[PDB]
Amino acid sequence: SKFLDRFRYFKQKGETFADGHGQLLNTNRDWEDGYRQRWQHDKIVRSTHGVNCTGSCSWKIYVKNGLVTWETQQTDYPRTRPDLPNHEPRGCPRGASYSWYLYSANRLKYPMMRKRLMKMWREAKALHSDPVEAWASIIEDADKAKSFKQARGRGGFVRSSWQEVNELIAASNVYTIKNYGPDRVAGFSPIPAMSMVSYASGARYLSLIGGTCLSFYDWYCDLPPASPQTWGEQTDVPESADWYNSSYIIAWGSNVPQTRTPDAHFFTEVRYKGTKTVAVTPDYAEIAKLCDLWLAPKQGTDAAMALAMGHVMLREFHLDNPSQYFTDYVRRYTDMPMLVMLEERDGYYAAGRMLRAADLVDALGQENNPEWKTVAFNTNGEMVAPNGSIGFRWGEKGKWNLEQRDGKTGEETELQLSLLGSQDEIAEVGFPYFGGDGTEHFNKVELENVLLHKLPVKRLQLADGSTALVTTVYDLTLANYGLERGLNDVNCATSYDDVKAYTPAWAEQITGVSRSQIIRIAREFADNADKTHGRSMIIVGAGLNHWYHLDMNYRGLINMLIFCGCVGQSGGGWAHYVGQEKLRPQTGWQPLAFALDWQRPARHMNSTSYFYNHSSQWRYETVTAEELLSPMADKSRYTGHLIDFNVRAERMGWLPSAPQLGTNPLTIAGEAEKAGMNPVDYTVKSLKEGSIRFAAEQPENGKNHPRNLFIWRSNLLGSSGKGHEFMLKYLLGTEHGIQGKDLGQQGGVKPEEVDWQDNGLEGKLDLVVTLDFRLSSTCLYSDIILPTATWYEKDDMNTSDMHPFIHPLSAAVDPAWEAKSDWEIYKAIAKKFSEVCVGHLGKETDIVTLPIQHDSAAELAQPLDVKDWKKGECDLIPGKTAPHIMVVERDYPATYERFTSIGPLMEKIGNGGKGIAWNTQSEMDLLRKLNYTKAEGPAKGQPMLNTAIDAAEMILTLAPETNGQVAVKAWAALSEFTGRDHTHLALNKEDEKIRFRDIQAQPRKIISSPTWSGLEDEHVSYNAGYTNVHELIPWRTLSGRQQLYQDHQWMRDFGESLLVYRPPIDTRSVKEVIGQKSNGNQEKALNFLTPHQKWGIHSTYSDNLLMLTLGRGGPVVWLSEADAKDLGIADNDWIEVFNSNGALTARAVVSQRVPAGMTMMYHAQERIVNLPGSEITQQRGGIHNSVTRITPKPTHMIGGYAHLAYGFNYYGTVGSNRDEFVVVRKMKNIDWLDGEGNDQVQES
Amino acid sequence: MKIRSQVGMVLNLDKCIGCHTCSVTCKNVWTSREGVEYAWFNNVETKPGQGFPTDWENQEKYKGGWIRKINGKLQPRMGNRAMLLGKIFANPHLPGIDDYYEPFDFDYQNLHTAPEGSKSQPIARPRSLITGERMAKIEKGPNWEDDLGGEFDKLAKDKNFDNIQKAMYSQFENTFMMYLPRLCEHCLNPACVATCPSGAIYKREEDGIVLIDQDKCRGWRMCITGCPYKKIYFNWKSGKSEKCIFCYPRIEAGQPTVCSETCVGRIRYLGVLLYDADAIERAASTENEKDLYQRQLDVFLDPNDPKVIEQAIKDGIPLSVIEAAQQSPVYKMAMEWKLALPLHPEYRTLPMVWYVPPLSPIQSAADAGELGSNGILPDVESLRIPVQYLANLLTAGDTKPVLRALKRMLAMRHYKRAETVDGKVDTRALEEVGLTEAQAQEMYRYLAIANYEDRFVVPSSHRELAREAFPEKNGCGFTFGDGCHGSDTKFNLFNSRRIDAIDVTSKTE
Amino acid sequence: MQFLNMFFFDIYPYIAGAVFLIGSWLRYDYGQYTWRAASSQMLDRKGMNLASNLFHIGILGIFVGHFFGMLTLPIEVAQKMAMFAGGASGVLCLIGGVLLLKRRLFSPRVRATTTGADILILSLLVIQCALGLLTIPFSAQHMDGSEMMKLVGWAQSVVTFHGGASQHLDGVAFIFRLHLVLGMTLFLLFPFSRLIHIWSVPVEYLTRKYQLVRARH
């Protein structure tokens, strides 16, 4: 009895202590069980997060009372070497809050459909027994179609059922494919590495039926086009543990603690090993808190600082006191010794295309691809075609390597770098200079648009009898940097204080960074690299990669690393981290995701061009290609709208198209047979005559736009959708907040390749289907919302660029309410589709266009210039001057049986990627035993793909990263090309086979694979380019080396053959609207930056109450104290940010750490929480992407050119956005537009 | 001399990346209930700033901690026993909910149920978790000042800027910020325990964790004022106070606290400290507040000293606890390397959660600078965070121990760089700070590599000692409601018996 | 009337007292987590310092008077003390009480988090205090202490378990009977309300060592 215990008062007194200050008691402590019983739980399950953060952290999911209650990080990753910190615990604040979603008030529990669509669907079905005909009756009626499209984003969702939505979806899909074409059905899902099978689910269903799979790396602007340019690689980087092997690191435009949270300890810990660190950010970012020095260049001007640093490096470590390490490195691993041809201009020369073996008399003994092999001079003045150029990759074998050898004699040669001291004469070559251009918001330095430099040349006798002057990439580079070499060049610097094209004094003016800092760090960085043989590293992120001129920012950093021999050495190099792009078991996952086990090829599309086109953002373009050309280019050869350049790239096979042709591609084969020719020839003939046209020429004719769109693992309309208001108007058909006038309303010049109409087609999408576990902004604007399983309710796998472990997502409990995993949702849609299509679609023949692919023999398309077949400059040759035209047979009724089985092509054709292929029969044999096999039907005898685990085992068994047997076969295939043995890279792990159930027990380190360029090894950490440098495997570029010189015609004419400084572009989005809708408060234009937020990963977790509570409770924008005071804005005041593109509402965070002139609205706070109506649009306030708009860059449209050839997520236009400016002002009326009568007015 | 043991904690602020993961995991486990939704047992504050609750370090306003009277005796700043009782009907110093923040949620369901034909896109507006009413605006939150969120003039009201000419820090080029994660300090001389009239708060003898007994607490809410770190939070619903419990359910079996094991930056170390409980009052009542730090180090005992080992055994400390104390990372950082310092020792509570101060980028200067004593690496005098600010936070204003900690970290860096970049032995910086190569290599092992087994050395709390673990293992957890738990007397009005006990006595002795 | 008389003054006092005591013990043994003062101060500090102090200082003054007055200087001198000192205490009590009730009913955060028992018990205390003050003019009609002698006789009979207690009340003014009935009702409701905090008045604190440590147990 507790009451009776009170009488033991005195007896429970033990000894006093500390001279009477304390008393020890002997009293009951049973109440302590109250907190013990909270901590106790039923079990822990291992799972992870399918969100785009790059973390790839394994967690312990706690189940208590049969419910998910919380999570804590697993700490059992295989430990790293004794001299490296281990990875545990990893984790981050966003991930720690995921459990909140399972039973929260924003969880999607049941399939939902827009009321108006449901009412019409059910009425239609009562008049049309076939659902395809019911869909037709609604969609072909303008008033019915408009009635549910205008209801998008306007409430009215009602609970439906899986059976009802699956029938409608299937019916709409069949209708669309049958009447317009398979490619009028599309799906958007990103970053498969975060949840491989989950991505694969929809991509596989879409690929089987012919739908388009939209890309994401380029669209999100995470693809740094400078990587494909320099290395012929999408992106390959050192793992975070490798930062620990570096002795000098610069974190440049990368907010490590905030955006690489689970890996940040490697950066804080390496400082204790003596490593110096430097933060380069315009604001006092979290990353600065961790570094030894904080440099703050004006945002967008980083390339200027990088050029000046490279200048100091070249001057001091290459010219004045040559570094033996650096000199040998650039000689063997760059295109510097390569010869460039000079073009005659008026009074001077311009750098032209690179010299090819085919240019010389005897073609330097090259009979195979002589026009694709570069040339250099050996140290004995003799011309040679060194091993490794792209020409040696295809049509022959044994010479595609970086052995310093003569491609003809097979003898060892030594390449010469500079011609200085052996030139026949000195010539003057003009270099473009853009440093004097720019808006009023950035400092400029006036020199001349064309800077003449004295270059040492040699005259050569070409094979066509003509004569030509050549110089090396090396000489061209030193001149471009402004390095005086004794020729008394007036445009070269006499010192670092000389304001010349690219000195420390010059950069100080452009960037505001003190020249002595530029010099001191450039020197320390290079000195460190010299002493350690390349252990200097640069960690770079979206701070630099999301600018329109991201390639100049990147090539500036890349050149610094190359000049110091840092790429390819552990502890050194280019460490680019953005999204979770590294899906390690790539060739195991690709066949699954794109149904390549059944049909080849699939229909991949580059999303930036796709949305620029279909959401009609091109109709509002303000940037012209003309204003981007080199001053030395022929302006008349590049006329037209930016979209015209895309259309031209598409018809030349450079970039993919979607929809592809202006006629249903399922109907072409029938017409070809009635005309007595095979489908391919009939298509080529029709294209030439114009009887069949590329759909991109007429995007608004009513048949050339996407009609069905699946969205999953994406919040396209609340996060990544640049040009949000254009998407609402043109794709959705709803109200929108666009403020500006289009080209037509302004009487502007209409495109020359695309039709124009004054009133653009709106509401293009007939059906938008989104799969999610929380009601996101995208769900709010959809027609049908399908509840999906959270990451703690389904099985899947995850990998990342940051570490080498593959681990799983696991179901801690069956999905709650009526939710289903993404795999099961698409499996069920595939099943309903298969039955609904009967009698509408059968065994069909599809004509599919396919762009010329990087890593295929066809990449050797247009070797010396650009020819447009539509202009008659050459014939239309699919696969060379146009896209390949492929025949694909589709068995529509068998879609489900195919979806659920591993197809026969793995056995009939094999598997492969990145230019190599291998036999995978034994893997298919194993899979029959692990997954069991189909008992009957179309896929009888094939392994099964019934569950997500079956799918994961397919990925694990087929990939070289997860199956030692495949790894050795993969390295063997590569060895054929290089003539060097590489199998030793995986022989010691040949018996290794990673299994799904084993990774649930402990994450497993993957196997060294030819798909990548670093090694998974116990003595050296993973570092990109390591195999190129150490195994002598060439980079997949024209020269086989790291490419400093970009000689493609478009690169030359757009002024980017060499790295040059380019100022932020003028989007012209403000001057036309500022002051036009005054609320009485002051307005001011500011640079609008959108770095990634601390309280969410993109928009995921943005609605999570834990994150909203640790943040500021909803959408906010950061302003400098000076700008806020100027505008009369106090901390937390409601503000409105707007331009021609749209408007957004949010609250201010006023801070000293934001420099005057810029505002930061951290990346994606989306449109569902705590947003009042806009005084500009009279609608709900918009989001950060309501003020942005897509503007493509022509150099990113280049294809058919070795390293510049297409690949899903490898090349394509990018969704850059940091150059944007906006008008900012304090709000007056705060109206919520909800009928609550709870509105406010901010005074003054 | 009475030896007791406790698992102390050291947080390395130099490695803190201010991510708050520690805060989210603690919240999910311990304080997601209505009544404590606004309470963050572990919370992280960006400095300069006033923190959570606002201006908690201002003891003139909040009245926390102890004062040393003229006669040399200790008294809670809130008042002696009678003064305290006299304030019981309405604690005049009590922090109000608005000093924390008004907890909120959002009407997410409006996104789901908005009716057909809405004139505008539906949205989820905020609602108070205290009243259930619509909030027109969210004006405060527990981490409102995160990353210098707010005008410098407002953040700089920070108590730690005392005695500092702070204007230069309002200049963009001189900007600095750091993170201060904090939890309960589980003090040796807790002011909370001393200020609770019901005696519901106690320090556990075996592991030093300080708890508020949820049975015995009567909700007098005086302890909240007493605690100078403001780490006790009133549960507005149960009417009782709660606080960080140092994850005792895990510590008891030798596991790290949740915030320790989930610390992403790998900055938290857990290790035993043996202390002389009989010296606590003498140490906490030392005349000069600048001597509290050292007076506390003097109460900590050397676990490898056989005199201490024999006394510990005599005083009941388990063998595995003494052994853990001998490999304690906390003892190494606080006592041997002198890298860890107490948080606000001037409150006189003898706190047991210590901190290694952070390094920072060099300050703004006329030029790019020159090589200093540490070569390309920083010299302590160049760091941009003012050392006086850190001394106000950790050493009662004395910059000497702060400079020694920072200089030693930089010296380790200089030594390691010589080794790993130049391949040479250079102990010059170590000699200057009084460190040996062996000490620098050990510092490096614990701070840099920081293997899991080196960050957490937590022994068992030995729940079997002086108790009956066998019947408990067999019957704990069957919560049917026997009504007999919590009292030593067996008589109970409901005529029941304990489920986890043996009622049939052996008659064979 | 005689039936109700014996019920309220001879029977009801023992029902209320039994419930008061066994209810307190049972709630102490089985409801420790529910045993608290239930401060609402943090949710709204405004006016609490004045209101709670007036209320408590006032009601403790009344308690001391009632305690010694009814369970233990001529009676008429005692009565003057009760009317003047007790009256003053009752006025302080009533002002504090009314302010607390206004706050509990109309301060949004306090009203939103209150239990019905908190409103009920405080309302009854405000009414009882007012009834108490209202008896003063009736006591003034008998300055020789005759009414007080009756009330004290009744109270004393009740606490020593002497039957016939109601007889002592013959002829006392009705106001006193109401006050007595509401007072006993407060004891009946006591164990089912926040009033259990009264049992826990922290007397031991005044002599307790500052630091408390609990041994393994």
Ligand SMILES: Nc1nc2c(c(=O)[nH]1)N[C@@H](/C(S)=C(/S)[C@H](O)COP(=O)(O)OP(=O)(O)OC[C@H]1O[C@@H](n3cnc4c(=O)[nH]c(N)nc43)[C@H](O)[C@@H]1O)C=N2
């Ligand atoms: N917590 C969290 N983590 C995530 C994500 C998230 O949403 N939240 N998303 C992923 C993804 S998908 C990406 S693409 C990255 O996180 C982006 O982060 P990063 O630090 O590279 O970019 P960011 O655009 O944020 O810019 C980093 C910082 O650079 C500064 N900055 C901004 N503009 C510039 C500039 O023009 N030049 C220079 N030198 N710096 C600039 C700024 O401090 C910014 O925070 C990554 N993990």
Ligand code: SF4
């Ligand atoms: S959200 Fe990403 S970084 Fe954060 S814990 Fe999850 S996997 Fe790791």
Ligand code: SF4
């Ligand atoms: S020790 Fe445990 S209870 Fe205390 S702050 Fe850390 S997680 Fe929370």
Ligand code: SF4
């Ligand atoms: S988890 Fe660790 S690194 Fe992150 S804020 Fe908390 S203490 Fe600092």
Ligand code: F3S
């Ligand atoms: S003063 Fe004591 S009674 Fe409870 S609310 Fe604080 S532990």
